[PDB]
Design an enzyme around this catalytic site. Structure first.
Site, PDB file in Angstrom:
ATOM      1  N   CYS A 123      19.066  29.466  53.761  1.00  0.00           N
ATOM      2  CA  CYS A 123      17.941  30.262  53.309  1.00  0.00           C
ATOM      3  C   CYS A 123      17.501  29.777  51.939  1.00  0.00           C
ATOM      4  O   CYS A 123      16.656  30.414  51.233  1.00  0.00           O
ATOM      5  CB  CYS A 123      18.395  31.721  53.285  1.00  0.00           C
ATOM      6  SG  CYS A 123      19.223  32.287  51.792  1.00  0.00           S
ATOM      7  N   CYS A 132      21.530  29.123  48.262  1.00  0.00           N
ATOM      8  CA  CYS A 132      22.541  28.310  47.564  1.00  0.00           C
ATOM      9  C   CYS A 132      21.905  27.318  46.562  1.00  0.00           C
ATOM     10  O   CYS A 132      22.461  27.085  45.498  1.00  0.00           O
ATOM     11  CB  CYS A 132      23.600  27.681  48.544  1.00  0.00           C
ATOM     12  SG  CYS A 132      24.366  28.952  49.599  1.00  0.00           S
ATOM     13  N   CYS A 178      27.422  30.628  55.048  1.00  0.00           N
ATOM     14  CA  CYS A 178      26.941  29.950  56.262  1.00  0.00           C
ATOM     15  C   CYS A 178      27.635  28.640  56.579  1.00  0.00           C
ATOM     16  O   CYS A 178      28.171  28.450  57.674  1.00  0.00           O
ATOM     17  CB  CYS A 178      25.436  29.673  56.193  1.00  0.00           C
ATOM     18  SG  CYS A 178      24.476  31.147  55.980  1.00  0.00           S
ATOM     19  N   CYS A 198      27.365  34.562  49.458  1.00  0.00           N
ATOM     20  CA  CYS A 198      26.024  34.635  50.070  1.00  0.00           C
ATOM     21  C   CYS A 198      25.043  35.313  49.120  1.00  0.00           C
ATOM     22  O   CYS A 198      24.723  36.492  49.270  1.00  0.00           O
ATOM     23  CB  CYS A 198      26.090  35.347  51.405  1.00  0.00           C
ATOM     24  SG  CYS A 198      24.515  35.295  52.443  1.00  0.00           S
ATOM     25  N   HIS A 248      39.241  44.471  44.224  1.00  0.00           N
ATOM     26  CA  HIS A 248      39.718  45.859  44.130  1.00  0.00           C
ATOM     27  C   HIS A 248      40.914  46.010  43.196  1.00  0.00           C
ATOM     28  O   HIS A 248      40.937  46.930  42.369  1.00  0.00           O
ATOM     29  CB  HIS A 248      40.022  46.371  45.541  1.00  0.00           C
ATOM     30  CG  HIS A 248      40.653  47.736  45.600  1.00  0.00           C
ATOM     31  ND1 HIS A 248      39.930  48.905  45.451  1.00  0.00           N
ATOM     32  CD2 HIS A 248      41.937  48.110  45.845  1.00  0.00           C
ATOM     33  CE1 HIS A 248      40.751  49.940  45.586  1.00  0.00           C
ATOM     34  NE2 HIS A 248      41.970  49.484  45.832  1.00  0.00           N
ATOM     35  N   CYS A 273      39.464  45.890  39.821  1.00  0.00           N
ATOM     36  CA  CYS A 273      38.229  46.648  39.666  1.00  0.00           C
ATOM     37  C   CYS A 273      38.361  47.713  38.547  1.00  0.00           C
ATOM     38  O   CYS A 273      39.400  48.397  38.432  1.00  0.00           O
ATOM     39  CB  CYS A 273      37.815  47.284  40.997  1.00  0.00           C
ATOM     40  SG  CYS A 273      36.246  48.183  40.897  1.00  0.00           S
ATOM     41  N   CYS A 293      34.647  55.943  42.229  1.00  0.00           N
ATOM     42  CA  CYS A 293      34.814  54.800  43.097  1.00  0.00           C
ATOM     43  C   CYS A 293      33.735  54.728  44.194  1.00  0.00           C
ATOM     44  O   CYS A 293      33.256  55.768  44.717  1.00  0.00           O
ATOM     45  CB  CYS A 293      36.206  54.859  43.723  1.00  0.00           C
ATOM     46  SG  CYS A 293      36.443  53.679  45.076  1.00  0.00           S
ATOM     47  N   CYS A 322      32.094  50.268  49.792  1.00  0.00           N
ATOM     48  CA  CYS A 322      32.641  49.146  49.017  1.00  0.00           C
ATOM     49  C   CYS A 322      33.702  48.360  49.766  1.00  0.00           C
ATOM     50  O   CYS A 322      34.712  48.927  50.223  1.00  0.00           O
ATOM     51  CB  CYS A 322      33.272  49.630  47.706  1.00  0.00           C
ATOM     52  SG  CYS A 322      33.600  48.229  46.609  1.00  0.00           S
ATOM     53  N   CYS A 348      33.980  38.086  40.680  1.00  0.00           N
ATOM     54  CA  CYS A 348      32.774  38.836  40.263  1.00  0.00           C
ATOM     55  C   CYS A 348      33.051  39.939  39.244  1.00  0.00           C
ATOM     56  O   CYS A 348      32.227  40.216  38.371  1.00  0.00           O
ATOM     57  CB  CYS A 348      32.074  39.458  41.485  1.00  0.00           C
ATOM     58  SG  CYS A 348      31.810  38.249  42.808  1.00  0.00           S
ATOM     59  N   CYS A 375      27.744  43.439  41.814  1.00  0.00           N
ATOM     60  CA  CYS A 375      27.504  44.276  42.982  1.00  0.00           C
ATOM     61  C   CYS A 375      28.196  45.629  42.890  1.00  0.00           C
ATOM     62  O   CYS A 375      27.582  46.629  43.262  1.00  0.00           O
ATOM     63  CB  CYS A 375      27.938  43.556  44.249  1.00  0.00           C
ATOM     64  SG  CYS A 375      27.214  41.944  44.243  1.00  0.00           S
ATOM     65  N   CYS A 377      30.260  46.317  46.854  1.00  0.00           N
ATOM     66  CA  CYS A 377      30.600  44.947  47.300  1.00  0.00           C
ATOM     67  C   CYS A 377      30.454  44.915  48.813  1.00  0.00           C
ATOM     68  O   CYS A 377      30.878  45.850  49.490  1.00  0.00           O
ATOM     69  CB  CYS A 377      32.048  44.573  46.924  1.00  0.00           C
ATOM     70  SG  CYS A 377      32.590  42.945  47.518  1.00  0.00           S
ATOM     71  N   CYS A 385      30.801  39.299  50.559  1.00  0.00           N
ATOM     72  CA  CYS A 385      29.967  38.160  50.960  1.00  0.00           C
ATOM     73  C   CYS A 385      30.682  36.823  51.011  1.00  0.00           C
ATOM     74  O   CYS A 385      30.175  35.879  51.626  1.00  0.00           O
ATOM     75  CB  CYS A 385      28.655  38.051  50.135  1.00  0.00           C
ATOM     76  SG  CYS A 385      28.952  37.399  48.508  1.00  0.00           S
TER      77      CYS A 385
HETATM   78  S1  SF4 Z   1      34.603  50.470  43.599  1.00  0.00           S
HETATM   79 FE1  SF4 Z   1      35.321  49.139  45.365  1.00  0.00          FE
HETATM   80  S2  SF4 Z   1      36.666  47.524  44.441  1.00  0.00           S
HETATM   81 FE2  SF4 Z   1      36.442  49.245  42.926  1.00  0.00          FE
HETATM   82  S3  SF4 Z   1      38.217  50.649  43.170  1.00  0.00           S
HETATM   83 FE3  SF4 Z   1      36.489  51.455  44.479  1.00  0.00          FE
HETATM   84  S4  SF4 Z   1      36.777  50.478  46.556  1.00  0.00           S
HETATM   85 FE4  SF4 Z   1      38.030  49.278  45.027  1.00  0.00          FE
HETATM   86  S1  SF4 Z   2      29.270  41.134  47.507  1.00  0.00           S
HETATM   87 FE1  SF4 Z   2      31.330  41.310  46.536  1.00  0.00          FE
HETATM   88  S2  SF4 Z   2      32.076  39.152  46.705  1.00  0.00           S
HETATM   89 FE2  SF4 Z   2      29.800  38.965  47.083  1.00  0.00          FE
HETATM   90  S3  SF4 Z   2      28.900  38.589  45.051  1.00  0.00           S
HETATM   91 FE3  SF4 Z   2      28.930  40.840  45.261  1.00  0.00          FE
HETATM   92  S4  SF4 Z   2      30.905  41.560  44.292  1.00  0.00           S
HETATM   93 FE4  SF4 Z   2      31.070  39.341  44.658  1.00  0.00          FE
END
Ligand code: SF4
Ligand code: SF4
Ligand code: SBY
Ligand code: SBY
Ligand code: SBY
Ligand code: FCO
Ligand code: CL
Ligand code: FE2
Ligand code: NI
Lengths: 277, 481
Positions: A12, A15, A115, A153, A202, A205, A226, A232, A241, A253, A259, A262
């Site tokens: 797409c 990248c 991909c 992605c 996680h 996180c 959370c 998530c 990330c 994200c 999240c 990806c």
């Molecule tokens: S926001 Fe997502 S990565 Fe963070 S503690 Fe909650 S489930 Fe885990």
């Molecule tokens: S979706 Fe999750 S793994 Fe992909 S860029 Fe966002 S935080 Fe990172």
């Protein structure tokens, strides 16, 4: 300056755009001093069979020594006709043909994006094109050229430039051969560099405490709890990330929304529905 | 007599395109465009939770993902009965408006500028056509190079602006059914405004002036590439909460006449497209995507959309022509100084010069300027701390359509929901309108028709062919999906 040919299959162009967002201090040096980006259809000056012929001439002069960047999956159905990347000598060149032609003579292949790495969206449920991950396609066709996966992605640009740099250092220390051996020493079982994909989102996180407390945001805009209940996928995703963040550190994200996993080989199907636990 | 020239890949566009033209007496006398790559998002989307669509559809196109995100959430808002809070509507505009700036800047400098500006002796700027018809002085060529480099910083800053309320870019996390996922805070609005200021400066001081100035050294390019001289806008950028007034108001223009846009007039033809013959001529609400890559006669994975049977073009030109806003102050001055033209509104330039190769580059530069005022408007309107999202339940049965304008032109997404799953999803995109093949009636697509008459006085260096194409800013990922 080893040449690089950037081939797009079922991609797409995301990248390539993500790379254009790089703030990595090495990126201009990479492109201006380290390698020569000899073929890239989105940005190069020339066009058509002229561009293809140029790529082929450079490939011949640098057989065994050039690098392939592949973006997008490779569709095998209908004799490769779901992805035609060019034409020369009155012969359409499918992504299937291009990988069988250039694949054997590259020093290595970087499969950039989920991909190319794993199939990603073009391979997901409901698709019909036989979209295939780079490494699987090359293996199915008996092409033993080493492949590194840089998924996402899109990927973070630092994951792409980062892998080039760690590859550059390995080769400077040990040659093309010793160099490549050292880079496998840092790939996980999914062929991706553990420097970027070695840690779980996680477990690192900032909302981990809320997760352990059982305090879940009920609306996207509640940034205190959370995100697990909102969908998530942090628990099943390996990426950095949480630390580098995105687009010059301005957001990521999990802060912004959720999240979606990806970078993972099961993206998107194994990560869906995106907005339910 | 007649020479056929096939260019595959056409480069410096997004995605996989082949152009094949016939050249007779120094002019293009026929043309066929082929989108050569297919993924099939409309079938991949079947059976998913409808909320997933606003993520999936973005991977149609990594240059314009926010347009797909927007069209999708607007479709979902309708289908879900969701009332996007006022502040969420404005936040969405801020996310999406920032990518208009990135996308037009990307297009002119990083896709298009090598058509007129000679890059240095390093790949990927060499090799190229020996007779590339590059006419700029040393000084203006150097400004072209200097600005392409500066533009690399500017477009990256645009994506920073997108990511502030968007999460990341490409592929925003921040737009969902029900509004936007993150309330703009005072701090982050300070950050967006500071970056917007640097972008604004570049567009005003560098970008709009260079397009006119390069344009002034290529005046012949205002005389070709007219095609059907027919345009579509479907509306975009809701300016209040009641779906009435929009930054870009919808309309159709054809054969000298303005008419309203009625989306029921849209049909997609497939005779010259690699899809099953029995799927031809369907409105998007009844759209079907059944690939037929071996079908005899077909030459593209792009369907052929027609409006009331008309082949129409879309994009900044079409929007600016339909709406006819005031020309920018830079444009007004430069038109006078370099072209000897006094103009006040866009249509003052005349149908012939507007619908031409270089006219489309000028319309894009003007529209970029026009977008600064809209963004500054949204930065005044936005309220830090006000909720931007509602959380609607997924319905068992529903339908929705989202219409908007992507940087390259008109976009719509239709969704049908059944058993709380996607039952049908249809996309009619910008470059689908521009870069489509012949319809069942043998009428050419907009870019195909705009190629007729293009000068190719040297068959070994046929530079004007890809130049005409690039003026439409094609992305074949969007066109085919
Ligand atoms: S926001 Fe997502 S990565 Fe963070 S503690 Fe909650 S489930 Fe885990
Ligand atoms: S979706 Fe999750 S793994 Fe992909 S860029 Fe966002 S935080 Fe990172
Ligand atoms: C994708 C195409 C590769 C080009 C990346 C260019 C990044 C330039 C960074 C300058 C600072
Ligand atoms: C544009 C990025 C493509 C990177 C290709 C791999 C680089 C390997 C460098 C080897 C130099 C010795
Ligand atoms: C239009 C052509 C733009 C050329 C930009 C050249 C980028 C490399 C700069 C080296 C100093
Ligand atoms: N801009 C953009 Fe993408 C295209 N063509 C959409 O819609
Ligand atoms: Cl967009
Ligand atoms: Fe479609
Ligand atoms: Ni697009």
């Amino acid at each position: 300056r080893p040449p690089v040919f950037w081939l797009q299959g079922q991609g797409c162009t995301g990248c390539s755009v993500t790379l254009l967002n790089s703030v990595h201090p090495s990126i201009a040096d990479v492109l201006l001093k380290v390698i020569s980006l000899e073929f890239h259809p989105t940005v190069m000056a020339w066009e058509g069979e002229h561009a293809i012929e140029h790529m082929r001439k450079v490939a011949e002069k640098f057989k065994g020594k050039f690098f392939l960047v592949i973006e997008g999956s490779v569709p095998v159905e209908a004799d490769g006709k779901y992805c035609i990347i060019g034409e020369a000598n009155h012969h359409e060149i499918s992504m299937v043909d291009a990988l069988k032609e250039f694949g054997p003579n590259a020093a290595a292949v970087l499969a950039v994006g989920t991909c190319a790495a794993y199939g990603g969206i073009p391979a997901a449920e409901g698709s019909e094109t036989g979209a295939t991950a780079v490494s699987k396609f090359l293996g199915d066709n008996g092409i033993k050229t080493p492949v590194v996966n840089i998924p996402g992605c899109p990927p973070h640009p630092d994951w792409i430039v980062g892998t080039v740099v760690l590859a550059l250092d390995a080769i400077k220390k040990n040659g093309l051969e010793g160099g490549l051996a050292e880079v496998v020493k840092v790939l996980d079982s999914d062929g991706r560099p553990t420097p970027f994909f070695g840690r779980n989102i996680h477990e690192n996180c900032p909302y981990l405490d809320k997760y352990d407390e059982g305090v879940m945001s009920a609306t996207f805009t509640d940034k205190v709890g959370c995100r697990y209940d909102l969908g998530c996928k942090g628990p099943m995703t390996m990426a950095d990330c949480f630390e580098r963040k995105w687009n010059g550190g301005v957001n990521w994200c999990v802060q912004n929304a959720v999240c979606i996993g990806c970078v993972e080989p099961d993206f998107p199907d194994g990560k869906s529905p995106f907005y339910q636990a | 007599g007649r020479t056929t020239i096939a260019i595959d890949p056409v480069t410096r566009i997004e995605g996989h395109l082949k152009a094949e033209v016939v050249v007779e007496n120094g002019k293009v006398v026929d043309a066929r465009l082929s989108g050569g790559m297919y993924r099939g998002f409309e079938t991949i989307l079947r059976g998913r939770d409808p909320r997933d669509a606003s993520q999936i559809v973005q991977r149609i196109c990594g240059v314009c993902p926010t347009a797909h995100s927007t069209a999708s959430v607007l479709a979902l808002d309708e289908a879900f009965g969701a009332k996007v809070p006022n502040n969420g509507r404005i936040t969405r505009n801020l996310i999406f408006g920032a990518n208009y700036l990135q996308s037009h800047i990307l297009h002119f400098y990083h896709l298009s500028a090598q058509d007129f500006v000679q890059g240095p002796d390093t790949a990927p700027f060499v090799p190229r056509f020996p007779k590339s018809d590059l006419r700029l002085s040393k000084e203006l060529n150097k400004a072209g190079v200097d600005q392409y480099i500066e533009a690399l910083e500017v477009r990256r800053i645009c994506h920073e602006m997108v990511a502030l309320f968007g999460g990341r870019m490409p592929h925003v996390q921040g737009q969902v059914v029900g509004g936007a996922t993150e309330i703009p805070t005072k701090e982050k609005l300070v950050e967006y405004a500071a970056r917007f200021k640097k972008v604004r400066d570049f567009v005003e001081q560098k970008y709009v002036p260079v397009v006119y100035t390069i344009g002034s050294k290529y005046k012949d390019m205002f005389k070709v590439g007219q095609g059907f001289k027919a345009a579509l806008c479907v509306g975009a950028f809701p300016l209040d909460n009641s779906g009435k007034k929009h930054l870009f108001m919808p309309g159709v223009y054809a054969k000298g006449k303005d008419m309203p846009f009625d989306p029921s007039k849209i049909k997609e033809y497939v005779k010259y497209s690699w899809f099953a013959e029995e799927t031809t001529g369907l409105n998007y609400k009844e759209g079907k995507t059944i690939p037929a890559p071996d079908k005899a006669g077909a030459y593209s994975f792009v369907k052929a959309p027609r409006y009331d049977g008309l082949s129409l073009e879309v994009g900044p030109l079409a929007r600016m022509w339909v709406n006819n806003p005031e020309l920018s102050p830079v444009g007004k001055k430069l038109l006078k100084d370099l072209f000897g033209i006094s103009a006040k509104k866009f249509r003052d330039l005349g149908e012939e010069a507007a619908f031409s190769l270089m006219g489309r580059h000028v319309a894009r530069a003007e529209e970029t300027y026009y977008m600064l005022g809209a963004i500054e408007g949204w930065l005044k309107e936005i309220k830090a701390g006000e909720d931007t999202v509602v959380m609607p339940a997924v319905p068992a049965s529903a339908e929705g359509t989202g219409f908007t304008e992507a940087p390259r032109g008109s976009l719509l997404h239709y969704v049908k929901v059944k058993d709380s799953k996607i039952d049908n999803y249809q996309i009619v995109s910008a470059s689908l309108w521009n870069c489509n093949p012949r319809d069942d009636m043998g009428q050419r697509g907009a870019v195909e028709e705009a190629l007729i008459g293009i000068p190719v006085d040297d068959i070994q260096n046929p530079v004007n062919v890809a130049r005409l194409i690039r003026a439409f800013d094609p992305x074949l990922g969007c066109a085919v999906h």
